[PDB]
Amino acid sequence: IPIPRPITTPHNNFIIFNKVHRFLTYGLANVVIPITRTVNDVTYVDNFVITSLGRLPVDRPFLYMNPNEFAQLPPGSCIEECNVRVTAFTPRIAFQATLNQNQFILHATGLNIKTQGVDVRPKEFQANEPMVVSSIDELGADENLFEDYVKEKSVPNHVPRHQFGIPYPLKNYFALVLQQNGTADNPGYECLQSHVNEIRCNGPPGEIVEYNYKPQLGLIKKAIPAVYTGVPSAVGGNSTLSCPAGAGNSQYRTADFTMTNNLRGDSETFKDTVVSNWTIATQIEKSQILHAGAFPSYTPRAQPSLHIGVKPVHALTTANLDDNLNNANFTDTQAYFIVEAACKVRLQYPSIRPLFNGPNTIPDNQIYSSSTLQYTHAV
Amino acid sequence: IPIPRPITTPHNNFIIFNKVHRFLTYGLANVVIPITRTVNDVTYVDNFVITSLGRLPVDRPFLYMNPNEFAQLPPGSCIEECNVRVTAFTPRIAFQATLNQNQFILHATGLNIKTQGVDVRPKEFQANEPMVVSSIDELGADENLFEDYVKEKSVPNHVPRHQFGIPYPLKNYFALVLQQNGTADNPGYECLQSHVNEIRCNGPPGEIVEYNYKPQLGLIKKAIPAVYTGVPSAVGGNSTLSCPAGAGNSQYRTADFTMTNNLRGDSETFKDTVVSNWTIATQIEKSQILHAGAFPSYTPRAQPSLHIGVKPVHALTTANLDDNLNNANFTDTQAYFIVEAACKVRLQYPSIRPLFNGPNTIPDNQIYSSSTLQYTHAV
Amino acid sequence: IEKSQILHAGAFPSYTPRAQPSLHIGVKPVHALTTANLDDNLNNANFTDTQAYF
Amino acid sequence: QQNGTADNPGYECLQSHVNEIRCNGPPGEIVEYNYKPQLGLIKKAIPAVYTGVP
Amino acid sequence: IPITRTVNDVTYVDNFVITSLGRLPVDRPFLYMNPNEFAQLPPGSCIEECNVRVTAFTPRIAFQATLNQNQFILHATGLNIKTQGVDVRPKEFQANEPM
């Protein structure tokens, strides 16, 4: 009368990575870099306004790991959590004619979605040091953008940034922008100051904010699929009833009229397993659905800055001219994650799962950047 | 005055597998299967003596796992522990002229090293059912031997043994042997009975012995090596002093004179990283050295049997003739193990470790079987 | 002196250690962009002292 | 040693074995190194004197 | 600081990477004693123990155009065996001081 036979399905796992970089921003001139947008009839010029603000590839994996020795071997793996903490200090002024002043320091957390302006603009300079004077559209560039950074390769003459624990400057600064040229019926800028924080860091202001994110669908590899059977030709296919109710269709839209919001479309497409992602936006949720679902997605983006030391004395009316500050911000991170060996059919390799398996995708694969125009998610 | 920079080296891990097979032995005739050994002058014939005893690829991985979906992806992984438990029951006699009798059941644990005889002999039969009458040398055959078993492939007409939870017979039975022909100066057999255990299992004798083994060096994959530098040409090489003392040299020997022990050689070779192991003897310690060392190695091997129901009645003098018994033994196993992502040099892939790294091997790679002549280890 | 010495017959594999002191480095990159390293000087007064027992 | 082609990995995680400080002023004292050399010989040693078979 | 290793066919150039790191003849006796008045007279003598303690301070910057900054300080213990690179390289300079 006893029972005998025991067996089972899965086998999950975890692991993390630790990294500590040294970066630096600079009291970038808080100015207007207007760019001439031209159609059949050139007008509506976008006036970008720079901010000393920086950006941390926090949303990108390389920031957290070994290049390859690390973006290595985790088939089907996802990163559930991760976080960082800047902890910077006192600004390195220089006079290449001011002396002393109150250097304020600052940072703000992924204001990216709630600030319409974007982090594009690593620009060009002038005869007055910190001086954005050309800003290049760091946008629509999406695995090459944050791709020079990747050097932390072939050229040994870029002392591996990390490993050797070497300082660094960031090349992407934030800014806000406005399309105002046609006539004068264009409102002002957003209350930037509102989303940010000043300090009068006497010395080493020590540690700043600790960023933390639990990416919704932090996938970062192809996922294992399943194995149908029961109604055959080489590659069978069955279609069964259900109660929707509008099964998700990678649905999205919006549109505007003269800087004023008004329009919203929707576009619908179909669901099929994804077959790809070296180091790309980990916040992989707006283009992924696992198995049929209903989700509207979002994302965050830390940044650190030293404000800016203005140098106006006994000089009156339409004046801005500034001072330099090199500041040693001190980030470091933790990338937590899943791992897997969920196998299914004895003979097949190397990983499987069921029918209610890995996330489905948009047939024609769409993928979205984030260095230009967020609203509530990657444009 | 604070400290800033944190980082680290490794990342280890574990995992296991569960399997439950059904096997069966049979009250194999406890007889002498003599085989004619012939040199330039044929003599010294080896008299094998069969035993109902079975054998469980306990020392081999497939016994514990998914074929490929399992002997899959664990680069550098090792299996530290593993164990099983037979738990069999009442023998299935049949009369194809006896009726009832006292069927004794039994098993013994890897007596292999302490019993000179080997598990070879899956043989041939006769006109009297359980009847070893030909025994083939299941030995010197080493990834093909326990290779039919592997079917638990292309031929769907071998209902995957496991998965479907199907019974099975074992094809390797143990026996003892002696080389005694020239003249009559050859001693008898070993006290086999001494290493084994009888039962008068009324019914379902329930569970039997639980085998357990913590393989010394249970490696089962190529291991990651390190990366030297400092004195270059394409592939540099340095030679530094030390205090031996005779650094291990894969050293071994022995030899005999007329069934009597007397000789022992030694042979010495050099150390270099191994570059290989699908499913082979997990007990991989007699041919492996990790980093310089001094070890003499050993191994174990479970087996299960139902003894044998003799059928001699009113029949006198030189008599053996036997009865059949099919018995449902009920094994199942657990394979524990290490896993790894020990990485080293950022840019290299996919796994590394240091200079005091993975086990070194015999230059010309020697590998040893275990279905013939143990003494204290694979011949 | 242990990797080349044996006192009276033995069996030893040997090792050794080596302290070092540094002041890191003050980098001087401002408003200058792409493939840049150029540095600042620092003279630092380290203060060792020792004990040799025997 | 990396020149032939581009199949040569990167450097070792140096930072990993070292320690930074933001020594405001006189960071005072740092590490105390200590070593008990295995065979710290530093001179010729005295030998013995056999006899008995001359 | 790459150096050109050359065999019958020059290749495999070793790229050294400097570190502000120093070295203390800790493993050498003179560091501990009188030259001769000390490496003197101990026939058969051995040194069983020995140790040191650095205890340094604030860095002496100079501008021979930066002003102030966060000078970090450091040391590490005989990483020599666990770091493949070596303490060689007392080198040469440039037009930009530490170089």
Side-chain angles (χ1 to χ4, degrees), chain A residues 4-8 11 13 15-16 18 20 22 68-69 72 151-152 160 330 344-346 348-350, chain B residues 4-8 11 13 15-16 18 20 22 68-69 72 151-152 160 330 344-346 348-350:
Chain A
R5 180 256 68 180
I7 314 83
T8 205
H11 298 90
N13 228 172
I15 173 58
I16 72 311
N18 44 327
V20 306
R22 304 169 187 49
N68 292 288
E69 63 185 342
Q72 155 264 274
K151 229 19 272 177
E152 322 175 16
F330 222 140
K344 191 41 45 47
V345 170
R346 43 128 69 168
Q348 213 248 37
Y349 334 65
Chain B
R5 180 256 68 180
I7 314 83
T8 205
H11 298 90
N13 228 172
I15 173 58
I16 72 310
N18 44 327
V20 306
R22 304 169 187 49
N68 292 288
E69 63 185 342
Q72 155 264 274
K151 229 19 272 177
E152 322 175 16
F330 222 140
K344 191 41 45 47
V345 170
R346 43 128 69 168
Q348 213 248 37
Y349 334 65

Side-chain angles (χ1 to χ4, degrees), chain B residues 117-146 148-152 154-274:
Chain B
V118 319
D119 328 70
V120 42
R121 294 195 37 202
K123 61 182 177 303
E124 208 33 47
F125 295 130
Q126 198 189 72
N128 292 337
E129 63 185 342
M131 270 318 299
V132 49
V133 302
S134 339
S135 70
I136 301 179
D137 267 320
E138 305 193 272
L139 50 86
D142 289 345
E143 290 177 350
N144 286 337
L145 177 63
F146 294 97
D148 286 345
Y149 274 139
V150 191
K151 229 19 272 177
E152 322 175 16
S154 67
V155 206
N157 315 289
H158 184 86
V159 189
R161 244 46 194 181
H162 194 44
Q163 294 247 298
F164 270 105
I166 209 65
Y168 197 62
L170 303 198
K171 342 295 194 64
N172 336 300
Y173 285 52
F174 187 65
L176 279 170
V177 71
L178 150 57
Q179 308 98 305
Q180 64 180 20
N181 192 31
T183 186
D185 289 345
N186 297 78
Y189 291 67
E190 333 306 41
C191 198
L192 183 288
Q193 187 206 307
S194 189
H195 320 195
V196 73
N197 64 34
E198 280 166 284
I199 339 296
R200 178 121 40 280
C201 38
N202 286 337
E207 175 250 71
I208 317 75
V209 50
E210 301 196 14
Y211 176 119
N212 187 59
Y213 183 27
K214 302 177 186 179
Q216 310 190 57
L217 194 166
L219 174 280
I220 23 182
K221 239 85 180 178
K222 64 177 283 186
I224 295 100
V227 299
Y228 176 77
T229 302
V231 168
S233 167
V235 63
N238 288 337
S239 64
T240 161
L241 256 195
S242 307
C243 252
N249 297 295
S250 188
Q251 183 65 260
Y252 68 95
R253 251 172 218 246
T254 284
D256 292 323
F257 177 80
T258 75
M259 290 302 287
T260 298
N261 170 62
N262 291 337
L263 297 174
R264 261 145 192 179
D266 279 345
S267 178
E268 295 85 357
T269 41
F270 277 116
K271 28 169 58 205
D272 49 290
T273 37
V274 186

Side-chain angles (χ1 to χ4, degrees), chain C residues 5-23:
Chain C
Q5 258 41 77
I6 55 101
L7 326 145
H8 194 281
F12 298 102
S14 331
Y15 279 46
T16 174
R18 296 161 176 56
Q20 27 224 155
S22 211
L23 67 211

